[PDB]
Design an enzyme around this catalytic site. Structure first.
Site, PDB file in Angstrom:
ATOM      1  N   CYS A   1       0.807  -1.175   0.000  1.00 49.38           N
ATOM      2  CA  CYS A   1       0.000   0.000   0.000  1.00 49.38           C
ATOM      3  C   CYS A   1       0.862   1.255   0.000  1.00 49.38           C
ATOM      4  N   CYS A  29      -1.984   1.742  -2.903  1.00 44.00           N
ATOM      5  CA  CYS A  29      -2.899   2.870  -2.614  1.00 44.00           C
ATOM      6  C   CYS A  29      -2.234   4.236  -2.693  1.00 44.00           C
ATOM      7  N   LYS A  34      -0.702   5.223  -6.092  1.00 44.75           N
ATOM      8  CA  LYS A  34      -1.797   5.174  -7.073  1.00 44.75           C
ATOM      9  C   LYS A  34      -2.716   6.434  -6.946  1.00 44.75           C
ATOM     10  N   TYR A  59      -9.454  -3.522 -10.938  1.00 44.25           N
ATOM     11  CA  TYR A  59      -9.182  -2.197 -10.367  1.00 44.25           C
ATOM     12  C   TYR A  59      -7.768  -1.687 -10.667  1.00 44.25           C
ATOM     13  N   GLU A 107      -7.580   1.773 -13.034  1.00 51.58           N
ATOM     14  CA  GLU A 107      -7.043   2.875 -12.288  1.00 51.58           C
ATOM     15  C   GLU A 107      -5.825   3.422 -12.999  1.00 51.58           C
ATOM     16  N   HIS A 117     -26.728  20.809   0.722  1.00 52.64           N
ATOM     17  CA  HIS A 117     -26.770  21.401  -0.608  1.00 52.64           C
ATOM     18  C   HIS A 117     -25.661  22.460  -0.710  1.00 52.64           C
ATOM     19  N   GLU A 145     -25.835  14.408  -1.751  1.00 51.60           N
ATOM     20  CA  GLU A 145     -27.252  14.680  -1.473  1.00 51.60           C
ATOM     21  C   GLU A 145     -28.211  13.923  -2.389  1.00 51.60           C
TER      22      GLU A 145
HETATM   23  C1  LIG Z   1      -1.753  -1.088  -7.559  1.00 52.70           C
HETATM   24  C2  LIG Z   1      -2.489  -1.392  -6.257  1.00 52.70           C
HETATM   25  C3  LIG Z   1      -3.447  -0.477  -5.815  1.00 52.70           C
HETATM   26  C4  LIG Z   1      -4.142  -0.706  -4.612  1.00 52.70           C
HETATM   27  N1  LIG Z   1      -5.104   0.240  -4.177  1.00 52.70           N
HETATM   28  C5  LIG Z   1      -5.699   0.067  -2.922  1.00 52.70           C
HETATM   29  C6  LIG Z   1      -6.576   1.019  -2.422  1.00 52.70           C
HETATM   30  O1  LIG Z   1      -6.855   2.037  -3.030  1.00 52.70           O
HETATM   31  N2  LIG Z   1      -7.170   0.820  -1.193  1.00 52.70           N
HETATM   32  C7  LIG Z   1      -6.931  -0.318  -0.435  1.00 52.70           C
HETATM   33  O2  LIG Z   1      -7.472  -0.468   0.652  1.00 52.70           O
HETATM   34  N3  LIG Z   1      -6.077  -1.265  -0.928  1.00 52.70           N
HETATM   35  C8  LIG Z   1      -5.448  -1.086  -2.172  1.00 52.70           C
HETATM   36  N4  LIG Z   1      -4.575  -2.090  -2.653  1.00 52.70           N
HETATM   37  C9  LIG Z   1      -4.412  -3.353  -1.899  1.00 52.70           C
HETATM   38  C10 LIG Z   1      -3.641  -3.109  -0.588  1.00 52.70           C
HETATM   39  O3  LIG Z   1      -2.532  -2.207  -0.795  1.00 52.70           O
HETATM   40  C11 LIG Z   1      -3.183  -4.426   0.038  1.00 52.70           C
HETATM   41  O4  LIG Z   1      -4.369  -5.137   0.310  1.00 52.70           O
HETATM   42  C12 LIG Z   1      -2.496  -4.296   1.392  1.00 52.70           C
HETATM   43  O5  LIG Z   1      -1.205  -3.718   1.310  1.00 52.70           O
HETATM   44  C13 LIG Z   1      -2.285  -5.692   1.915  1.00 52.70           C
HETATM   45  O6  LIG Z   1      -1.704  -5.662   3.193  1.00 52.70           O
HETATM   46  P1  LIG Z   1      -0.834  -6.830   3.714  1.00 52.70           P
HETATM   47  O7  LIG Z   1      -0.261  -6.316   4.981  1.00 52.70           O
HETATM   48  O8  LIG Z   1      -1.704  -8.012   3.653  1.00 52.70           O
HETATM   49  O9  LIG Z   1       0.349  -7.136   2.681  1.00 52.70           O
HETATM   50  P2  LIG Z   1       1.490  -6.076   2.254  1.00 52.70           P
HETATM   51  O10 LIG Z   1       1.146  -4.705   2.604  1.00 52.70           O
HETATM   52  O11 LIG Z   1       1.823  -6.380   0.861  1.00 52.70           O
HETATM   53  O12 LIG Z   1       2.683  -6.602   3.183  1.00 52.70           O
HETATM   54  C14 LIG Z   1       3.511  -7.693   2.798  1.00 52.70           C
HETATM   55  C15 LIG Z   1       4.934  -7.397   3.204  1.00 52.70           C
HETATM   56  O13 LIG Z   1       5.614  -8.605   3.515  1.00 52.70           O
HETATM   57  C16 LIG Z   1       6.855  -8.629   2.788  1.00 52.70           C
HETATM   58  N5  LIG Z   1       7.190 -10.093   2.800  1.00 52.70           N
HETATM   59  C17 LIG Z   1       6.637 -11.037   2.047  1.00 52.70           C
HETATM   60  N6  LIG Z   1       7.159 -12.216   2.351  1.00 52.70           N
HETATM   61  C18 LIG Z   1       8.051 -12.006   3.314  1.00 52.70           C
HETATM   62  C19 LIG Z   1       8.887 -12.844   4.023  1.00 52.70           C
HETATM   63  N7  LIG Z   1       8.875 -14.138   3.754  1.00 52.70           N
HETATM   64  N8  LIG Z   1       9.692 -12.318   4.966  1.00 52.70           N
HETATM   65  C20 LIG Z   1       9.684 -11.007   5.220  1.00 52.70           C
HETATM   66  N9  LIG Z   1       8.900 -10.191   4.543  1.00 52.70           N
HETATM   67  C21 LIG Z   1       8.080 -10.661   3.597  1.00 52.70           C
HETATM   68  C22 LIG Z   1       6.496  -7.982   1.460  1.00 52.70           C
HETATM   69  O14 LIG Z   1       7.697  -7.527   0.838  1.00 52.70           O
HETATM   70  C23 LIG Z   1       5.644  -6.830   1.971  1.00 52.70           C
HETATM   71  O15 LIG Z   1       6.459  -5.709   2.386  1.00 52.70           O
HETATM   72  C24 LIG Z   1      -3.870  -1.869  -3.850  1.00 52.70           C
HETATM   73  C25 LIG Z   1      -2.906  -2.790  -4.298  1.00 52.70           C
HETATM   74  C26 LIG Z   1      -2.213  -2.550  -5.493  1.00 52.70           C
HETATM   75  C27 LIG Z   1      -1.173  -3.551  -5.956  1.00 52.70           C
HETATM   76  C1  LIG Z   2     -24.942  33.861   0.416  1.00 53.12           C
HETATM   77  C2  LIG Z   2     -25.810  32.649   0.819  1.00 53.12           C
HETATM   78  C3  LIG Z   2     -25.268  31.371   0.822  1.00 53.12           C
HETATM   79  C4  LIG Z   2     -26.057  30.262   1.188  1.00 53.12           C
HETATM   80  N1  LIG Z   2     -25.490  28.964   1.185  1.00 53.12           N
HETATM   81  C5  LIG Z   2     -26.315  27.834   1.381  1.00 53.12           C
HETATM   82  C6  LIG Z   2     -25.806  26.546   1.226  1.00 53.12           C
HETATM   83  O1  LIG Z   2     -24.628  26.339   0.901  1.00 53.12           O
HETATM   84  N2  LIG Z   2     -26.647  25.453   1.422  1.00 53.12           N
HETATM   85  C7  LIG Z   2     -27.977  25.613   1.797  1.00 53.12           C
HETATM   86  O2  LIG Z   2     -28.688  24.623   1.976  1.00 53.12           O
HETATM   87  N3  LIG Z   2     -28.474  26.898   1.963  1.00 53.12           N
HETATM   88  C8  LIG Z   2     -27.650  27.999   1.751  1.00 53.12           C
HETATM   89  N4  LIG Z   2     -28.179  29.293   1.891  1.00 53.12           N
HETATM   90  C9  LIG Z   2     -29.569  29.452   2.401  1.00 53.12           C
HETATM   91  C10 LIG Z   2     -30.594  29.047   1.324  1.00 53.12           C
HETATM   92  O3  LIG Z   2     -30.298  29.691   0.082  1.00 53.12           O
HETATM   93  C11 LIG Z   2     -31.996  29.433   1.748  1.00 53.12           C
HETATM   94  O4  LIG Z   2     -32.234  28.814   3.015  1.00 53.12           O
HETATM   95  C12 LIG Z   2     -33.064  28.915   0.784  1.00 53.12           C
HETATM   96  O5  LIG Z   2     -32.910  29.506  -0.532  1.00 53.12           O
HETATM   97  C13 LIG Z   2     -34.442  29.256   1.379  1.00 53.12           C
HETATM   98  O6  LIG Z   2     -35.519  28.910   0.530  1.00 53.12           O
HETATM   99  P1  LIG Z   2     -36.921  29.618   0.645  1.00 53.12           P
HETATM  100  O7  LIG Z   2     -37.802  28.955  -0.360  1.00 53.12           O
HETATM  101  O8  LIG Z   2     -37.341  29.666   2.072  1.00 53.12           O
HETATM  102  O9  LIG Z   2     -36.643  31.200   0.292  1.00 53.12           O
HETATM  103  P2  LIG Z   2     -36.085  31.728  -1.101  1.00 53.12           P
HETATM  104  O10 LIG Z   2     -35.408  30.639  -1.822  1.00 53.12           O
HETATM  105  O11 LIG Z   2     -35.336  32.971  -0.893  1.00 53.12           O
HETATM  106  O12 LIG Z   2     -37.436  32.068  -1.859  1.00 53.12           O
HETATM  107  C14 LIG Z   2     -38.000  33.345  -1.703  1.00 53.12           C
HETATM  108  C15 LIG Z   2     -38.631  33.813  -2.983  1.00 53.12           C
HETATM  109  O13 LIG Z   2     -39.837  34.564  -2.763  1.00 53.12           O
HETATM  110  C16 LIG Z   2     -39.662  35.886  -3.430  1.00 53.12           C
HETATM  111  N5  LIG Z   2     -40.676  36.723  -2.734  1.00 53.12           N
HETATM  112  C17 LIG Z   2     -40.560  37.264  -1.514  1.00 53.12           C
HETATM  113  N6  LIG Z   2     -41.701  37.892  -1.214  1.00 53.12           N
HETATM  114  C18 LIG Z   2     -42.535  37.725  -2.235  1.00 53.12           C
HETATM  115  C19 LIG Z   2     -43.817  38.139  -2.456  1.00 53.12           C
HETATM  116  N7  LIG Z   2     -44.415  38.846  -1.512  1.00 53.12           N
HETATM  117  N8  LIG Z   2     -44.399  37.823  -3.627  1.00 53.12           N
HETATM  118  C20 LIG Z   2     -43.763  37.097  -4.547  1.00 53.12           C
HETATM  119  N9  LIG Z   2     -42.526  36.678  -4.368  1.00 53.12           N
HETATM  120  C21 LIG Z   2     -41.898  36.986  -3.216  1.00 53.12           C
HETATM  121  C22 LIG Z   2     -38.208  36.185  -3.225  1.00 53.12           C
HETATM  122  O14 LIG Z   2     -37.838  37.129  -4.238  1.00 53.12           O
HETATM  123  C23 LIG Z   2     -37.620  34.779  -3.504  1.00 53.12           C
HETATM  124  O15 LIG Z   2     -37.559  34.475  -4.894  1.00 53.12           O
HETATM  125  C24 LIG Z   2     -27.399  30.429   1.520  1.00 53.12           C
HETATM  126  C25 LIG Z   2     -27.941  31.707   1.519  1.00 53.12           C
HETATM  127  C26 LIG Z   2     -27.156  32.805   1.183  1.00 53.12           C
HETATM  128  C27 LIG Z   2     -27.786  34.206   1.169  1.00 53.12           C
END
Ligand SMILES: Cc1cc2nc3c(=O)[nH]c(=O)nc-3n(C[C@H](O)[C@H](O)[C@H](O)COP(=O)(O)OP(=O)(O)OC[C@H]3O[C@@H](n4cnc5c(N)ncnc54)[C@H](O)[C@@H]3O)c2cc1C
Ligand SMILES: Cc1cc2nc3c(=O)[nH]c(=O)nc-3n(C[C@H](O)[C@H](O)[C@H](O)COP(=O)(O)OP(=O)(O)OC[C@H]3O[C@@H](n4cnc5c(N)ncnc54)[C@H](O)[C@@H]3O)c2cc1C
Ligand SMILES: NC(=O)c1ccc[n+]([C@@H]2O[C@H](COP(=O)([O-])OP(=O)(O)OC[C@H]3O[C@@H](n4cnc5c(N)ncnc54)[C@H](OP(=O)(O)O)[C@@H]3O)[C@@H](O)[C@H]2O)c1
Ligand SMILES: NC(=O)c1ccc[n+]([C@@H]2O[C@H](COP(=O)([O-])OP(=O)(O)OC[C@H]3O[C@@H](n4cnc5c(N)ncnc54)[C@H](OP(=O)(O)O)[C@@H]3O)[C@@H](O)[C@H]2O)c1
Lengths: 490, 490
Positions: free
Chosen positions: B50, B55, B58, B191, B195, B463, B468
């Site tokens: 790994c 991992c 990669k 994989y 990858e 959001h 989501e």
């Molecule tokens: C390209 C690739 C991508 C991968 N991507 C992921 C990933 O994204 N996520 C994930 O969870 N897993 C991933 N894996 C799998 C993961 O890395 C292995 O499952 C993990 O390392 C296994 O752990 P281990 O301890 O069983 O063996 P290893 O980590 O391989 O340990 C074995 C060690 O024992 C040594 N050894 C062997 N025989 C002897 C001996 N007789 N005496 C002394 N030392 C010895 C070896 O040289 C080695 O250092 C990937 C594997 C590969 C090949």
């Molecule tokens: C800068 C900023 C960043 C934000 N970031 C997030 C975020 O990342 N994630 C998240 O979940 N929320 C976020 N929010 C909050 C989110 O946008 C609001 O909670 C959501 O839009 C509320 O929905 P609503 O329907 O209650 O009101 P609004 O979506 O504001 O609807 C009100 C509508 O009614 C209109 N209106 C008002 N009075 C009248 C009327 N009398 N007659 C006709 N139309 C009218 C208004 O013009 C408006 O169009 C953010 C807000 C701001 C200001």
């Protein structure tokens, strides 16, 4: 008798969800959607905040900043890239607006195919079961419906201060800004401010965040602080415990030059600096004051502007429902509004009994270093379950992809919060790292099934993927053990 | 009458986990690790497959390919990038080897701190409780232990054909190749092949994959086919139902020129083409034949080379255990080998009873379009639970990040497989899209808690994040409904 079975006020996330679903049942549905302009005259099409001035353009600009990082990373992975690539604001916002525009027309078309009447007009109740639609040119028309859905969302709040409306911009303006913002002051410290400061710095701008008190009030404060430190270490400058008092224009321009004056929060001190752009991100106000709720007897919370609602999204008036951001005590998230809207139409016309579940709804802050979470913050878990009944497992990790660019070890961080009284039920989940949202979604699903810490530990990780960190959290905050890499163990 | 309490043979993923854990209990532990060289003389350092040739390198090369994509995407998001960025193989593999090198030393240091004796030597059993360590220069030394852990992993298989050992390379060689592979034939279709074909294309090489039969035998075949079609559409060429018969060198070089001859699988047809590099990715063989198992009476499956093991990783010989890739009927994944190794040490010296759970282990294929999954493939769910008891919910989706670069709509695909006899228990989870691994990890957690389809639908999405999509799968395969975007609805 009535003109429509359902009139939806607001064509945003919730509104359009409700409309699309109600149309499945062959009912006469009308969506009213009108976008009142920003103080500077910014307008946009159908689709609400999320589509035009929220999640969509925000994440797109986030992406623009990530790509800047990817350009630097690429050198070390063998891409023969010269030393500096400049960014072009206008080209970026053109692409963004292009996508938005096609969402605008996508929805307009979606409504038409679903046979939903769309009226680009401002809705206002005039009396029981009756609403007035005032269009763009001032022309009024009255409509009646058996039921109504209030889905009118919120708008950016301003400060009570001289020059803010005339010179500052808000997120509503930011995403279609016809020129590069230049040197920027971001006022505020929640998800909008941080996300924006984040990507403005990421595309190469001089950015300052002015903080009244804490970062991200409501979120886990230790996570918030970590996000803060990261932003500070990667460019963004922070002014702590200051509030602007006036914004005055030194020069008009695109961008012009603005002088900002700010006062300390606890002392008497004053500071001045000048900026090209001041972005206000200081909260949002519900659009519930000017929709004629008095005339139909709908009760709202007077101070906050939010609408109290039954667990079925019903107001005190039986035939009027409310959805999305305007709801009192709910969450202000697009997919929540969409779910609420969809399930509402199901209950009303589909004979469903499935309510919308608002517990453990995952969220993600797209700060330069993303933050994903779900469940309780640490402090809230302690408050709710008692300090010595909480166990916090945590760890730093280092995304494999950052090793070769050779940057940012021990920044990414993961914690799960467990209830010792309940088989170590995971009651909170927090991750600070790349693709935080992708990571969190699945774990939010597991929280819904009452994932326990021993179930978590019995799940095998996928290697090599950041998310795998969560299957191997073995060091508790209580144990006091060290959690720094590298690490390098087994 | 013992030198050590435990001798671990193989210092890979599993071996090093077991070592690090056993050391917690103050036992005398020795790790034997030796890397026998590839036919071309390639070797590497501590850490196993790994770390050196799996991992880690990669994923890092996969990342090099994604960054190639990110360079292209960046133009639309406003980055003034020129038209073509060339890639440099030598610079990439230098950085990769650098990181690997620091993992090599990391582990060598970790073992020293944990007080584990590390012996860079080939292990071979000579008799009950006795092993011989043959070092690099042929010097032998005999050691005894109360217990032994076989953790020796596997090595690439060759074909039985002329020229394959002398001219072709395998994954063992690929990741430290001193020169750019040039025009490449990848032989194999699991994989490893895909990858590698993937990232070689991604960095701009001419790549051909030669397939004996189907893609990714063992994985969901429809998922496999999709991966295949995507690769075809994005450069990689596929030769279907052909097996090489000989590889002959036309010219030595770095890279040289090779002439590959292949025969059809079902007809008599013959094809020739020439390549710079032939990469063989055609399975791996267990390292269990030459470790002197006869002398201690350990039974292996003679045909496969794998070692049968109890649910506690015990061989037929009570004091000898086996871990990782060599295990019969298990899974050949790093985090599985790690978990098995860690939990074994817990059982042996920590009085734990917790076994290693091998059901529903998530995996990810890092093909250019990533593929994540967990649980059963569709065909396996049908076989296991009966065709009409399975419901498949599915959908295409379009990552928001791809909309502005304007590419690859309706390629990413998600599906969940539900058991209608069991409250629609989600028994299989499949996703094709960016950050598949990040998405899958969390859902694998949910599968361990018996996630049902209604629990899934009640979970609110984040959001705007690809993951989501899983919260809103409403179209079944049985319903025959259309699942193409865009779309664009509510
Ligand atoms: C390209 C690739 C991508 C991968 N991507 C992921 C990933 O994204 N996520 C994930 O969870 N897993 C991933 N894996 C799998 C993961 O890395 C292995 O499952 C993990 O390392 C296994 O752990 P281990 O301890 O069983 O063996 P290893 O980590 O391989 O340990 C074995 C060690 O024992 C040594 N050894 C062997 N025989 C002897 C001996 N007789 N005496 C002394 N030392 C010895 C070896 O040289 C080695 O250092 C990937 C594997 C590969 C090949
Ligand atoms: C800068 C900023 C960043 C934000 N970031 C997030 C975020 O990342 N994630 C998240 O979940 N929320 C976020 N929010 C909050 C989110 O946008 C609001 O909670 C959501 O839009 C509320 O929905 P609503 O329907 O209650 O009101 P609004 O979506 O504001 O609807 C009100 C509508 O009614 C209109 N209106 C008002 N009075 C009248 C009327 N009398 N007659 C006709 N139309 C009218 C208004 O013009 C408006 O169009 C953010 C807000 C701001 C200001
Ligand atoms: C969508 O939500 P959103 O992120 O836009 O906002 P939000 O989540 O409602 O929170 C408002 C953010 O702006 C700050 N803020 C509120 N009023 C302010 C003022 N008058 N002067 C300076 N800062 C102020 C808040 O700090 P506080 O934590 O100090 O309220 C907080 O950081
Ligand atoms: C780690 O696993 P891995 O991905 O390296 O391999 P693996 O998962 O064991 O599978 C071997 C892959 O190589 C193919 N293959 C096996 N023997 C072959 C041969 N003699 N000629 C051509 N192709 C052959 C297999 O095809 P089959 O599906 O035809 O066995 C499969 O595509």
């Amino acid at each position: 008798s009535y003109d429509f079975d359902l009139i939806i006020i607001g064509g945003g996330s919730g509104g359009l969800a409700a409309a699309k679903e109600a149309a499945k049942f062959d009912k006469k549905v009308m969506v009213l959607d009108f976008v009142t302009p920003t103080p500077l005259g910014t307008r946009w099409g159908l689709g609400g905040t999320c589509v035009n001035v929220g999640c969509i353009p925000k994440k797109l600009m986030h992406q623009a900043a990530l790509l800047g990082q990817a350009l630097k990373d690429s050198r070390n992975y063998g891409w023969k890239l010269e030393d500096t690539v400049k960014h072009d604001w206008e080209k970026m916002t053109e692409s963004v607006q292009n996508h938005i525009g096609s969402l605008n027309w996508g929805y307009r078309v979606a409504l038409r195919e679903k046979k939903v009447v769309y009226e680009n007009a401002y809705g206002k109740f005039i009396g029981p079961h009756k609403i007035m639609a005032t269009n763009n040119k001032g022309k009024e028309k009255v409509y009646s419906a058996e039921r109504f859905l209030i889905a009118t969302g919120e708008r950016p709040r301003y400060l009570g201060i001289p020059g803010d409306k005339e010179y500052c911009i808000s997120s509503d303006d930011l995403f279609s800004l016809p020129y590069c913002p230049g040197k920027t002051l971001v006022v505020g410290a929640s998800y909008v401010a941080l996300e924006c400061a984040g990507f403005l710095a990421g595309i190469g701008l001089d950015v300052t965040v002015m903080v009244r008190s804490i970062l991200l009030r409501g979120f886990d404060q230790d996570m918030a602080n970590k996000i803060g430190e990261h932003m500070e270490e990667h460019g963004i400058k922070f002014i702590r415990q200051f509030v602007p008092t006036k914004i005055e224009q030194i020069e008009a321009g695109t961008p012009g030059r603005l002088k900002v004056t700010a006062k300390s929060t606890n002392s008497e001190e004053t500071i001045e600096d000048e900026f090209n752009t001041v972005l206000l991100a200081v909260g949002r106000d519900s659009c519930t004051r000017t929709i004629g709720l008095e005339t139909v007897g709908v009760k709202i919370n007077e101070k906050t502007g939010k609408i109290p609602v039954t667990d079925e999204e019903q107001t005190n008036v039986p035939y009027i429902y409310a959805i999305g951001d305007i709801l009192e005590g709910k969450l202000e998230l697009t997919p929540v509004a969409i779910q609420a809207g969809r399930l509402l139409a199901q209950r009303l016309y589909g004979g469903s009994t499935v309510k919308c579940d608002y517990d453990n709804v995952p969220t993600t802050v797209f700060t330069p270093l993303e933050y994903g979470c779900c469940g309780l913050s640490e402090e809230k878990a302690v408050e709710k379950f008692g300090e010595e009944n909480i166990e916090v497992y945590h760890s730093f990790f280092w995304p494999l992809e950052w090793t070769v660019p050779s940057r940012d070890n021990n920044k990414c961080y993961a914690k799960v919060i467990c209830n010792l009284k309940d088989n170590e039920r995971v009651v909170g989940f927090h991750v600070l790292g790349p693709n935080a949202g992708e990571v969190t979604q699945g774990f939010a699903a597991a929280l819904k099934c009452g994932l326990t810490k021993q179930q978590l530990d019995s799940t095998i990780g996928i290697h090599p993927v950041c998310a795998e960190i969560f299957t191997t959290l073995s060091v508790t905050k209580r144990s006091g053990g060290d959690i720094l890499q590298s690490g390098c163990x087994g």
